[PDB]
Symmetry: C3
Subunit: 123 residues, 3 copies
């Protein structure tokens, strides 16, 4: 799965390091994805650049997951839950302030190493 993570400015590099590791482990543990398929990249936002429920500057975290289609509803649920808890724990956040979005990508639509599709790679 390919994760892009969006957090508020203000956490330390060490805290953000632990978040990346915790998200990666959360993917491996919750759905059994091979470690080599797990990537996550992080971006920080100033409070002035976010709005939540009509309130500019309210805290949020967002984990977007592009992953190969075919996971059961139950594994998808485990993944959302594990990622939400990984963010809340790593950043000292309330889980109500975190959102996780899964985008099911068909195997013909997901690239892997050297520009082959996941279907081409026999995933």
């Amino acid at each position: 799965p390919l994760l892009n993570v969006h957090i508020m400015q203000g956490h330390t590099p060490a805290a953000k390091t632990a978040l990346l590791k915790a998200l990666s482990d959360a993917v491996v543990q919750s759905i059994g994805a091979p470690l080599a398929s797990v990537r996550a990249i992080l971006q920080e936002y100033a409070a002035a650049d976010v709005i939540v429920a009509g309130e500019v500057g309210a805290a949020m975290a967002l984990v977007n997951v592009d992953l190969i289609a075919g996971r059961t509803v139950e594994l998808k649920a485990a993944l959302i839950l594990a990622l939400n808890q990984a963010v809340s724990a790593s950043l000292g956040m309330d889980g109500k302030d975190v959102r996780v979005v899964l985008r099911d990508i068909p195997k013909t639509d997901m690239g892997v190493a050297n520009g082959l599709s996941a279907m081409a790679a026999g995933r």
Copy 2:
């Protein structure tokens, strides 16, 4: 709906604040989304970081919307139009330079507070 907005560098803080509020209002009023479900986060780009129709540095704005599946085509048209107008009015841009992308996320695939899925929470 979760919005990530991509705009050119150089706009005033007031205009970016007005943009975020106008985007949130556009979602609530065009599709009747619960206010608590509406989040938007903003990212700025240097001209050197964009290419449009082969022209490097062409001004653009982009609104990506991850929203729960099931809205009618009619509601999606109202949403796309309302978001385009929110960008155009807030930033003083031509609507031809703005793009809106809606990504339908099944209720099993959309996280809500505390890492339950939208389906789990009875949406």
Copy 3:
């Protein structure tokens, strides 16, 4: 097709211009998209903000493509391959460190100029 590209910090301005042009060319050449429909925007990441296969700071590149649904499996394979090669050639990267994700967007869900869906304007 609307591309958002994610690369590591530290590449030359010439390399990033070449990357934007090569990505645009790859889309036109591989699937026959009209040049006017092709946009790409670029974001750079610090080593501290990425994790790949559990390794914080491992170099990566990511090309996310939102495109109107309907392209065949073969055209998608050509696109994923061409985009991976545009990144690797432009940035001097190993193609194993690049990923491409395609997101099929129904015409009802893809905004075009002035807040109309691609269906309201017919793509």
